[PDB]
Design a protein around this ligand. Structure first.
Ligand code: ZN
Ligand code: ZN
Lengths: 309, 319
């Protein structure tokens, strides 16, 4: 009962309302979606989505722990907060997805597969987010939390939907992320069927996809390895007006994709693996010695160092 | 006696390997037709290679170079560098054409081997060898500016092409180019059969292809429109140690090829006279886009199985 996740995976109720300390309340807007302090007229609005892939449980446990503390009065909440346990069936079964990768059904893509239960879910989550952010009068933030089976040179990294030449870009966000422990950021301006692109472009939110580490079943996550994100998120909800100690860009490498559709790499090759100059299939060929392979699967993208402009 | 014009001597082939005295006890040595080395014995001095007329119809740079040589031989201009001047495609220059059989700037980097039956291939190989021997003797800086002009106009009147570098790109030279008139630089991401690529890679020198303006026949060039490159060149030969006023990369836009417009079977949605570096707005594309791409060297006439143009995108330096 005191467990938000437990309730979200069973849907004991459906639209009930849980009383919260300080006069607040937790309202279930839909299965696995709970809004807290939504009535906060002019406070910052934070969307925390997790479990888009059911096997990535570390962020799920982290988010559940925060919710518990808010209900126990151990953690203060001064933001409008909407938490979404995304793929409920996948989370309950402990798998990436049932019939289709949900982080490929967003941005409206679900319309191409209107029969899949995960598409229906993705459409419902898009609307909820859209309505949540439409009521925002201050900052609009969205962190879609992931973990991954495939290792990475930069264990923790973010994917940043860079849009409109960064006219609404916040370097403080890059600072906040670097403080969270993010070791690298992937900038992309082109459209994508991800939840962070959707909220970024459709809801005009500062949205980021965060790859926080290794995928593990529930009970096998070392939450200590997520202290950075856990501390930062708690601090955001507690006091969103806290200043951010700038960003020493010297330790926050930025990358961008130069060309996709990229086989000649081991099955367990790590994300961000540098490709040596003159390598067949980095026919696509490596050049310079600064390009890196990302999200490989024989189908992958070749990235390069980027700079803000 | 001999012609006061180095260019005319080369065209009229008065001699072949004659040497002319230069003020200050220096000398000008004709190493081959249209190739003359001045102050070559200057040990420790910066070495400069100026090639022009690779395309015979691009005469503006030819007149500017020839004017400088006449001033040096007259004592009007001082020379403190090892200088090698090359009137590249002599036959094409004498005929006023881009080339006779094959584009010479497609025959360097060893590409001349593929067409040994062509005089332009023999000439290209000779120029490679001469340049190689010239730079091999260099003890200071090795600089090569291959001067060109063109029929098709450009958004960036004067621009440079930076050969593919296998050090990275030297910004000290980008600075000199900037404070010279160059308004943009294209950075090659793959090897090319150009003279500037050959010297940059084979002779490992700082080489650039310079598109200085509009192509025009002799006597129809507004040498005023070339004051920037002219003064910058005369200043280099006289006082090559003059520091360059840094390089504000925020004023010199750089570009690189994004992808080629492969043609097969076909319609080019741009005027036949579209200028190079014309910005492509977000929307129109080939059948990605962001209002940052520009068209370069469009040629829808080829329509074979090759490309009919190149789409370039902004390029940023590491620092
Ligand atoms: Zn994931
Ligand atoms: Zn030319």
């Amino acid at each position: 009962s005191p467990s938000f996740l437990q309730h979200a995976l069973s849907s004991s109720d459906t639209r009930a309302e849980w009383p919260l300390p300080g006069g607040l309340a937790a309202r279930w807007l839909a299965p696995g979606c709970v809004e807290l302090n939504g009535d906060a007229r002019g406070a910052d609005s934070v969307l925390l989505s997790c479990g888009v892939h059911g096997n990535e449980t570390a962020p799920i446990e982290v988010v559940d722990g925060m919710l518990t503390d808010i209900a126990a009065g151990q953690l203060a909440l001064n933001c409008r907060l909407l938490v979404m346990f995304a793929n409920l069936d996948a989370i309950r079964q402990g798998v990436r997805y049932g019939n289709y990768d949900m982080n490929r059904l967003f941005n409206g893509a679900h319309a191409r597969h209107p029969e899949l239960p995960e598409s229906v879910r993705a459409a419902e989550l898009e609307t909820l987010a859209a309505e949540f952010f439409a009521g925002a009068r201050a900052r609009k933030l969205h962190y879609d939390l992931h973990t991954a089976i495939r290792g990475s040179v930069f264990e923790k990294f973010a994917i940043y939907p860079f849009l409109h030449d960064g006219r609404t870009h916040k370097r403080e966000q890059l600072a906040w992320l670097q403080r969270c422990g993010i070791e690298a950021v992937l900038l992309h301006t082109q459209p994508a069927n991800t939840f962070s692109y959707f909220t970024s472009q459709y809801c005009e939110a500062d949205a980021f996809t965060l790859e926080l580490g290794k995928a593990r079943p529930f009970g096998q996550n070392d939450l200590s390895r997520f202290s950075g994100i856990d501390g930062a998120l708690r601090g955001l909800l507690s006091n969103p007006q806290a200043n951010v100690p700038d960003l020493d860009e010297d330790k926050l490498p930025l990358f961008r994709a130069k060309y996709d559709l990229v086989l000649n790499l081991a099955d367990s090759v790590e994300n961000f693996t540098l490709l040596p100059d003159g390598m067949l299939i980095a026919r696509y060929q490596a050049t310079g010695g600064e390009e890196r392979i990302l999200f490989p699967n024989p189908a992958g993208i070749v990235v390069e160092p980027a700079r803000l402009p």
